[PDB]
């Protein structure tokens, strides 16, 4: 059954509508998600 939510996965046009170390994961999803953009090299001056 597309256009409906078989389980929880309701399919819109392009978006998907689903539903439902602790503080470490919550902080890495709150602030430190794309904070590791300029953290790749760590002075790797190759």
């Amino acid at each position: 059954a597309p256009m409906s939510d078989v389980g929880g996965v309701l399919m819109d046009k392009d978006a998907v509508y689903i539903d439902i170390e602790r503080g470490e994961g919550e902080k890495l999803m709150t602030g430190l998600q794309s904070v590791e953009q300029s953290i790749a090299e760590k002075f790797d001056g190759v």
């Binding site: 978006a15 890495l28 760590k42 790797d44």
Partner: protein, 805 residues
């Protein structure tokens, strides 16, 4: 209900649009219940898709049981309790109770080498061997998702190492850290919470690609051109893959159908279905080919070839371990071992498997030689192909389950399957100055395995060195050379003082099979209830059973390898070994100099290897004592395993010399049962054992000569009469076979022998007849060498008679 992210569905969309695999790494506890959603997204991105799913785990499932009658009666008694209604299933229960899941342990990953899956669920992260990684991400196909679940210790390592360079704090493992950094580098991989949020540390930006295959259309065009008989039927049955594989099958068919002899050897990677092309060409060869064919695979390892043979036969016209017997209905084929079918090679066609080079030269002589060269040595086999046989050997490397994949690129980069044989030196004559210098530096393996770009390029050079034409090692051996406690390395590459650059002249991996350090590491690892890191000590601790070797620490060579240029490369390896003996005797940067002047308290230094001739010559330039071997035929090459161990320490010379003496005493008797190898190499081994005894002993293990009454009891008086009959008459077997055992024993005991007389003593020790051993070795003057052997026997009999009697 909540919209998830603009990137995680779009990644699956463009992954199935470009037919590329993709990697999800999920953290958190409630992570099993989001594989329903990712499998639904993977199917609805493109219905025309494989449905099966792997659940590789190591010891125990997460929250379920994988037995549907068991969980069915469990949910039946849950109904009978009444905490849950009848027609109710949460999506994880529905996912495991409706989908097609194949369950494997992490140990038996070799059981699923052939089949194909749409999804792979790696359950545990902390133990992930790279051979298992290479076996699962290869079988995941182009619309595929490989998901990896995590643990709180890995979350601590993630929060640590996601800042710049820090690690986790207690054998420490860096392969999983190199894994985390590679997934941070990958564009087709990202890390997701248990709540379907995003950690953008691994491939942050991802756009939805635009809505829409020329090599596939060229494949269809050339396939239809070949279509417009039974040759086209075989071509369409084979070409389930790239036009490279189709062109290879067509060219092998053209060069091996009616031309009866060519030597065609198709070389390819782990993909592309080389065995599939062989088994799909088998039916065409049975049609337009001889009545007998000869396969040379491993025994009971011909799954894809036999499956494609039966599949193509059923396509065209058909109907102690396993069954590999020959069948026909309107043909013969046998998957045999090494060439015991020399007189049974009436088959005009033989197809061999990938690399035993001398056994390959023995088997491939008088028929059409098809050969499958899997990459998974090759240069030397191509040289032996060009050194003899209209060789039309050609094949290509386009993938089968993809056209090209960043997941395959990251897997090859992390598991280090990529190689490069470029020079990149200062000079070869200036590397000969390094061969005069014998200068070596340590590896600093923590900073080496920390994935940085130039460090990874030099580490790929080091891996190409450490597995360059080696003795068939593997990715689990790379993980042992990375993440073991008893390990070190040495890169004696450059002598020059130029700018940033260099090479790898010789890698050499040590293994501290110790007493103190190994006892410390083993008492540590007994809390983790595992551990096996003492091979060279434990072989002699049962064979020779010495408390001295129980108390002395030891370094053991895991591997050591140099370039494949010339004999100067063996000179470079000898200089590296001599520099290592000098090194034993006399974040972080990815080298060491002061630690190259540092070591441990080690007594013995040994290398364990197979009994090879050049390895024996290297062991003699090494001159490390040729200690106790084992003549059990290790079925890879059939080579006997010898562990030559020097003692380079304060006071161990009497122990090592007595061990060499016991090995020498055992070898002359053990050359009768299961050591019938050579004459010159046997003399070299006896000379190496006596050289070890002479170098180690001063006058301690100095044996007395053959005593009078004991020598009278060892022979007979009439046996010595027959010896005199050989001295003044013929040396026939009525007096030269009953006494020859004691003759060869006393000759190898203790007053000199020639080269022909030494081969005669070794020939009587090997107990072969006259026309075999001397005619194989010298191949000249058979009866004259037999008379010289009789004269040496007469001189020995005259010496023993004039000594005792």
């Amino acid at each position: 209900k909540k919209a998830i992210d603009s990137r995680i569905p779009s990644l699956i969309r463009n992954g199935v649009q470009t037919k590329q695999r993709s990697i999800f790494v999920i953290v958190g506890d409630r992570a099993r219940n989001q594989l329903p959603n990712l499998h639904y997204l993977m199917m609805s991105a493109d219905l025309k898709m494989n449905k099966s799913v792997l659940w590789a785990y190591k010891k125990k499932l997460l929250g379920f049981t994988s037995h549907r009658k068991k969980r069915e009666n469990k949910i039946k008694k849950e109904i009978k309790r009444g905490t849950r209604e009848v027609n109710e299933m949460d999506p994880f229960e529905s996912f495991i109770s409706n989908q097609n899941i194949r369950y494997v342990y992490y140990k038996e990953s070799e059981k699923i080498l052939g089949n194909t899956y749409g999804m792979c669920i790696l359950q545990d992260f902390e133990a992930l061997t790279p051979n298992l990684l290479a076996r699962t991400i290869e079988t995941v196909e182009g619309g595929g998702i490989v998901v990896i679940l995590l643990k709180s210790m890995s979350s601590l390592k993630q929060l640590y190492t996601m800042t710049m360079d820090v690690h986790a704090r207690y054998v420490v493992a860096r392969f999983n850290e190199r894994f985390i950094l590679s997934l941070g580098s990958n564009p087709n991989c990202l890390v997701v919470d248990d709540e379907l949020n995003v950690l953008p540390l691994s491939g942050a930006k991802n756009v939805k690609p635009l809505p829409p295959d020329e090599l596939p259309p060229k494949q269809l065009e050339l396939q239809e051109l070949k279509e417009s008989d039974v040759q086209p039927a075989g071509s369409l049955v084979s070409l389930s893959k790239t036009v490279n594989q189709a062109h290879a099958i067509l060219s092998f068919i053209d060069a091996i159908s009616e031309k009866t002899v060519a030597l065609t050897a198709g070389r390819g990677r782990g993909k592309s279905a080389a065995l599939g092309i062989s088994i799909a060409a088998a039916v065409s060869h049975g049609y337009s080919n001889i009545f007998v064919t000869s396969p040379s695979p491993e025994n009971l390892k011909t799954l894809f070839e036999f499956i494609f043979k039966g599949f193509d036969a059923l396509g065209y016209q058909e109907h102690f371990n396993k069954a590999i017997v020959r069948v026909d209905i309107k043909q013969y084929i046998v998957p045999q071992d090494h060439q015991v079918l020399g007189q049974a090679e009436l088959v005009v066609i033989d197809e061999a498997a990938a690399i035993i080079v001398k056994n390959l030269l023995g088997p491939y002589l008088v028929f059409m030689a098809s050969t499958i060269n899997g990459y998974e040595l090759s240069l030397k086999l191509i040289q032996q192909l060009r050194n003899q046989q209209l060789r039309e050997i050609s094949l290509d490397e386009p993938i089968r389950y993809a056209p090209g994949d960043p997941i395959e690129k990251w897997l090859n980069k992390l598991l280090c399957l990529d190689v490069t044989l470029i020079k990149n030196p200062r000079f070869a004559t200036r590397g000969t100055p390094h061969p005069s210098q014998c200068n070596l530096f340590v590896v600093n393996r923590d900073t080496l395995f920390s994935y940085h770009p130039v460090s990874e390029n030099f580490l790929e050079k080091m891996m190409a060195l450490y597995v360059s034409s080696h003795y068939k090692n593997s990715p689990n051996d790379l993980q042992l050379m990375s993440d073991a406690p008893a390990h070190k390395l040495f890169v004696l590459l450059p002598p020059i003082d130029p700018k940033d650059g260099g090479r790898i002249p010789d890698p050499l991996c040590v293994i501290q099979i110790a007493l103190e350090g190994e006892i410390s590491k083993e008492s540590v690892r007994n809390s983790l209830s595992r551990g096996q890191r003492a091979g060279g000590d434990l072989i002699p601790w049962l064979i020779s059973q010495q408390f001295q070797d129980e108390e002395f620490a030891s370094l053991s060579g895991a591997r050591i390898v140099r370039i494949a240029t010339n004999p100067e490369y063996a000179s470079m390896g000898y200089g590296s070994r001599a520099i290592e003996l000098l090194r034993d005797y006399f974040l972080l940067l990815k080298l060491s100099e002061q630690p190259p002047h540092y070591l441990h308290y080690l007594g013995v230094s040994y290398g364990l290897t197979q009994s090879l001739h050049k390895f024996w010559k290297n062991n003699s330039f090494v001159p490390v004592y040729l200690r106790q071997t084992a003549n059990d035929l290790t079925g890879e090459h059939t080579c006997v395993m010898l562990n030559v161990l020097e003692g380079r320490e304060s006071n161990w010379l009497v122990e090592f010399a007595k061990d060499f003496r016991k090995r020498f005493l055992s070898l002359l008797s053990y050359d009768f049962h299961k050591f019938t190898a050579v004459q010159a190499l046997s003399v070299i081994e006896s000379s190496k054992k006596a050289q070890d005894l002479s170098d180690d002993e001063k006058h301690d293990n100095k044996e007395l000569t053959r005593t009078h009454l004991d020598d009278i009891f060892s022979p007979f008086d009439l046996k010595r009469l027959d010896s005199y009959s050989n001295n003044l008459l013929d040396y026939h077997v009525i007096g030269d076979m009953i006494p020859m055992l004691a003759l060869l024993y006393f000759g190898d005991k203790m007053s000199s022998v020639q080269s022909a007389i030494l081969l005669a003593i070794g020939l009587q020790r090997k107990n072969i007849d006259t026309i075999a051993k001397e005619l194989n070795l010298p191949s000249n003057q058979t009866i004259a060498m037999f008379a010289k052997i009789m004269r040496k026997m007469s001189q020995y009999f005259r010496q023993l008679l004039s000594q005792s009697i």
